[PDB]
């Protein structure tokens, strides 16, 4: 089975071509922390710690072109599938993990054995190591699950509220000419307030979710970075 | 977190000081060191060779998370049924009177 | 001769018509699996030997020197014996691309040669079979095409409870 | 530089004479390298000959140390002249590029012709 | 002619090979019935009997792929290991 | 200059694509069958009698 | 980023910029489509389908 | 030697389609190349008028597509299922009757979870046709 | 149900179907055509890359002796849990 | 001065980007693509009827049956398949004629 379909970004691609044929400065980035990993001067890393900047920027642009514009009615999030997001996070996370593993430095994993020598190795430290190795994969799964669930829940809530507002607006506006007009005006004002609140909440939540999505990947990278001190 | 420096040859405690599951496997019990997993873990921790405990675990998880998990899911053998459909070993043989083609020569 | 190109069609057909796989054909495939594992083992042993031989003297001293993890006494004796044996004579110890070639090319050649000739052996085995799979192999090498539905054309044997379809 | 048809004609015309010259240079350079290698193994420092290991402080990855894994043979003039060393260096460059091309040929069979 | 019973209730207590062969036989019977009707009507068979032929084809593909396991040392060991006396008793007790 | 020309042509192409997609292209697998394809099989064998 | 641009002070100024002219046209469409639905779907002569009980989406999704 | 790997190998003249390209760039640059048009990760511009123009346009073309391509399928399914189970049966009706049926479908959409449930649940004793009417 | 139906791609254009047998056979023919010529020896890494893994996987399939039944991958109906056929 | 992004053409830069900048990511992506097309590229007819149609499956015309009919007719005509062969019917041709005369 081969399905031929298209993304919902064609107009946005047209706008990108029109508005970015000439150069422009970028000064606001959703996830700026990918650019500033080191905060104490004289510290440097021999690992390619800035390799994630390009992927981070492209991912932010792609996910923003989809998620932020999805607030417009009838706009489609073409990639909104659980396993597709799993594939995306698998690519990024496993690629960086395999980059660290291909280094063939086993000492890098010494920190997985949690605790000190005082703690019993077999019954405490080894079980903590098992849990931490499990937690890495669980972090991957939780990242993709969080991204999927937030979008799904937000858009379900928006659709249901919009349906209710359409119903009351269309089939109960005649009460403005009736003696119970005050009740309808109260309900209508409440619906407008909830409409604005929901839109603001979704706008904030989309950007926050993208920030967290990139932060998880950068945290994976940072967990295995070692910094030398210049002398 | 911080940089790791391998211990010097003089900073590594003797093997006799390591403890097993029950107690130290000193003289007359040295060959039991090979079989006692906890003694090997304690020895590795003592020699700062903790990776021997951590590297096999993580990799195993990765191997399960990446390659074997799906292999078991898609191609693994489920539990056998109560009434089993064994092979009668009658299928495949050519019928009587059939003239097979000659082999290459 | 390239036996894999001929054998890929036959293997796919056997998978599609695996119902007619006699126990002899199954034993042939199990032997192929065993020989693949044996080839892997010997190639890995050769690779390890080449790696050890070309290893630097300091590397060997670190690897086969103190401390001893177990300190049983046999461990130290074996490590000292191997270290003395390796460091006694002169050894060509290349680095970089050179060590890659020396360690890998012999291993690749050995593994590939063994696997290729075992594939030829399996082709001969299937040629000598007196089953429908063997007949298909012979027809494939004769006409050059895989004849699907052959088992039901020549009426290959079926269980006593499934011969009704042949009843014509 | 970009490819051109004139250079293609030049290199196709001089392909076989070039290969023959490369083979002769290979013999000469092997002789020079053999002299240098014998001298290094005989008179070199223990660390240089034994190939002492120097690991990075962050990921403990081995790499050549300039102090220990490099050695200037001050008395090489007795066995090998300056011109021979220059010849060996030039041949090393040519041999590296030829080796990569030969590896591509062996890897891809006859599909490396284009 | 008579079609075999391949319903879920009948299929539940049946070996895979028997079920596959019965499905194949049912497909063949349906195909021959359709061909007989086409011949009686005089119309071409290809224009009427394509779907039944495809059903026979797919049932053949499912039937020829399955090879019942050979009863050998390792297979018998696995079967005996899983089906212990305790498990057999538990299976007998369960009404589902 | 190069990017200006390339983006001009890309913009025209995207404009045509957008118009076709959102105003001319029918959706596949319609319930009524009046618009769009229902799908079909490809890569079917041809001239291989021995295959059956 | 919502940094700047023309911002009409009141309704009457929306005609001082082409973009806001298009915006106010679109707002007119948005808000005026609701009264039209009120008139159309609360009409006296609107009649429910007699065969509405023959089939419903509730059957199909169940 | 066949194709250049460098972008500097030009395929056209510098003045090819200069005028149309300059008009296109003028359209692009007039509103976007401004100090207050600072974007957030290239996706959200700072100019208000870009929002004011693009939100309505995006909604308009998406709504046209939804009304004329996506919801039309559900509407046609309801018409076919409720009036014969075949397209010819629906076409036996007049345009006015089809209009009535489609507008009833719109009514059902607007109620959705809040409208009366007698639009799809037949009350006991109702004389209208049931589900087995055409069977 | 109806709200859930909003979450579908909106620009589906065409769907094509192909049997696994057919395109696998066509791919094998392409591979044989490109790996056949004499100027690609069997011991070359390219040829082994093309052939060895496929041979190994097919051998693993043939050697399989499972006590359970694996339903046909391309049945007409794979939605019924109580009917593997 | 020379830069990959400014001097190289797009295909060349694409290869360089995914070979000397993000080779592991490209490898993992190709791995996942192969997995998806090896295990997630099939849909049964029942699955299509349940979920494969926007408004639901139109049983009143049964497009799947028409699609399969076209497929099988094309295969039969192109491959010269004799669908009356005993293996397809399970009975001899003469028995088929007898059945035709009976029914
Ligand atoms: C049988 C029926 C037909 C179908 C056959 C199909 C055969 C299939 C074989 C089996 C394949 C199995 C696997 C399939 C997997 C599919 C997966 C999938 O879809 O994933 C979703 C995924 C969705 O991606 P997306 O996010 O939408 O972005 C991809 C878009 O293309 C947009 O992305 P982008 O913008 O980043 O792309 C770059 C873009 C950059 O932007 C542009 O260049 C702008 C233009 C964009 C064009 C592309 C968008 C298409 C929009 C819709 C169609 C437009 C209108 C078409 C009108 C048709 C009318 C009938 O540049 C281009 O597109 C380069 C091409 C430009 C062409 C320009 C042509 C100019 C001609 C001028 C002629 C003048 C003549 C004058 C003569 C005068 C004489 C006097 O699809 C893909 O990633 C691509 C899947 C493709 C898989 C390979 C398929 C095989 C190739 C088939 C070619 C058929 C050609 C014959 C057709 C003939 C007409 C019937
Ligand atoms: C450097 C990288 C670092 C970064 C890593 C990044 C990634 C994360 C890490 C984790 C991996 C993530 C997963 C990513 C996907 C990768 C692909 C994947 O997973 O595919 C698995 C995939 C799994 O197979 P499958 O497709 O699922 O099919 C399952 C079937 O079993 C397939 O059947 P088959 O026909 O293909 O045969 C397969 C066969 C493979 O094995 C063989 O063919 C035979 C053995 C091969 C040996 C290879 C050479 C080893 C060295 C030889 C000796 C050297 C020293 C010589 C000098 C000695 C002096 C005394 O295995 C078996 O069937 C099991 C046979 C076991 C027999 C056991 C008999 C009992 C006695 C022996 C054990 C007990 C001893 C007790 C002693 C007690 C003493 C007190 O492929 C395989 O595993 C098999 C094919 C590849 C085999 C390669 C063999 C070499 C492996 C490397 C060895 C050296 C490195 C390790 C040590 C390092 C130390 C520093
Ligand atoms: C189409 C062909 C397809 C080919 C397929 C095969 C794969 C690709 C072939 C080769 C491709 C070309 C490039 C390869 C990588 C190049 C790496 C490199 O640049 O190295 C430079 C480096 C030169 O630098 P150097 O300064 O001279 O020395 C390195 C420094 O020491 C460096 O100093 P350092 O400070 O970095 O020291 C650390 C260094 C120290 O190591 C070394 O550098 C020494 C050399 C490596 C020793 C490895 C052996 C270790 C002991 C193994 C013991 C196994 C016992 C098992 C017993 C089983 C009993 C039942 O590294 C390590 O510690 C890493 C140890 C390895 C860990 C392996 C972990 C694997 C986990 C497995 C996970 C699970 C897998 C799936 C499940 C399986 C089971 C079901 O080269 C080497 O040292 C040797 C390179 C060897 C290249 C590979 C040769 C390939 C031969 C292929 C034969 C088979 C062909 C099959 C074809 C099939 C049909 C198509
Ligand atoms: C038929 C089967 C084929 C198998 C498939 C092969 C597939 C292709 C892979 C590549 C194969 C090699 C291609 C030919 C290379 C040329 C010969 C050579 O080594 O040149 C020296 C040169 C040494 O490089 P280096 O960096 O200076 O080495 C550092 C050492 O410290 C250097 O040591 P040093 O500093 O002490 O100085 C020593 C130097 C001093 O010498 C000199 O100064 C005099 C010049 C000597 C070298 C001359 C080379 C000339 C190259 C051009 C040849 C003419 C081409 C003509 C083309 C047109 C023809 C019409 O002499 C050397 O260069 C000796 C190096 C060590 C020997 C390496 C050869 C080992 C393999 C051969 C034995 C195999 C036996 C099999 C037994 C089977 C048992 C079962 O080699 C290279 O340039 C390296 C190759 C570059 C391409 C690498 C491609 C990836 C390789 C991955 C292989 C992984 C394992 C295999 C499986 C792959 C599966 C994916
Ligand atoms: C010194 C000589 C002076 C001569 C003076 C002459 C003056 C008069 C003019 C001459 C006549 C006009 C010349 C051409 C002008 C073209 C337009 C233009 O000016 O563009 C600006 C520019 C002008 O050149 P330049 O700026 O001087 O230099 C460019 C730079 O050096 C390098 O550029 P770059 O690398 O930076 O970028 C190149 C390219 C990146 O590079 C490529 O794309 C090249 C590679 C693409 C390959 C794609 C196909 C791959 C297929 C798979 C592989 C197949 C293998 C098969 C193997 C064999 C099998 C047997 O970039 C892009 O893709 C972005 C631009 C795309 C343009 C938009 C295209 C769609 C416009 C649609 C408008 C109409 C809409 C419909 C209207 C309908 C009305 C009703 O041209 C380009 O950028 C070149 C674009 C080339 C795109 C090719 C796409 C082909 C797609 C269709 C393939 C059909 C295959 C059919 C097969 C059938 C089999 C059954
Ligand atoms: C950085 C933060 C940005 C915040 C931007 C805030 C924008 C504020 C908008 C105010 C209201 C706008 C009303 C528009 C009305 C259009 C016509 C209409 O009928 O629409 C009704 C539609 C739907 O209204 P409805 O649901 O009542 O429709 C009823 C229709 N029936 C009954 C048939 C169902 O209105 C909307 O959907 C507007 C929602 C806007 C939410 C904000 C989206 C911001 C993200 C996109 C930004 C795009 C910028 C692109 C710039 C270029 C990029 C390169
Ligand atoms: C309605 C049901 C819903 C169910 C939902 C279930 C979840 C689905 C989630 C899908 C999206 C997320 C996917 C993430 C990626 C998962 C990856 C995965 O598990 O794939 C494993 C699978 C395993 O492959 P396989 O399944 O073909 O395994 C073959 C094993 N036998 C033969 C025994 C059956 O990987 C692939 O599919 C890719 C294989 C080809 C690429 C790798 C080739 C090299 C292999 C190296 C080792 C062996 C050869 C020797 C060494 C090399 C010599 C040259």
Swiss-Prot record, chain A:
Signal peptide (from-to): none
Keyword Repressor: no
Localization: Mitochondrion inner membrane
Topological type in the membrane: Multi-pass membrane protein
GO biological process, one term: ATP biosynthetic process
GO cellular component: mitochondrial inner membrane; proton-transporting ATP synthase complex
Keywords: ATP synthesis, CF(0), Hydrogen ion transport, Ion transport, Membrane, Mitochondrion, Mitochondrion inner membrane, Transmembrane, Transmembrane helix, Transport
Ranges that cross the membrane: 25-45, 46-66, 84-104, 118-138, 144-164, 178-201, 208-230
Family: Belongs to the ATPase A chain family.
Main function: Mitochondrial membrane ATP synthase (F(1)F(0) ATP synthase or Complex V) produces ATP from ADP in the presence of a proton gradient across the membrane which is generated by electron transport complexes of the respiratory chain. F-type ATPases consist of two structural domains, F(1) - containing the extramembraneous catalytic core and F(0) - containing the membrane proton channel, linked together by a central stalk and a peripheral stalk. During catalysis, ATP synthesis in the catalytic domain of F(1) is coupled via a rotary mechanism of the central stalk subunits to proton translocation.
Record's subunit section: F-type ATPases have 2 components, CF(1) - the catalytic core - and CF(0) - the membrane proton channel. CF(1) has five subunits: alpha(3), beta(3), gamma(1), delta(1), epsilon(1). CF(0) has three main subunits: a, b and c.
Protein name according to UniProt: ATP synthase subunit a
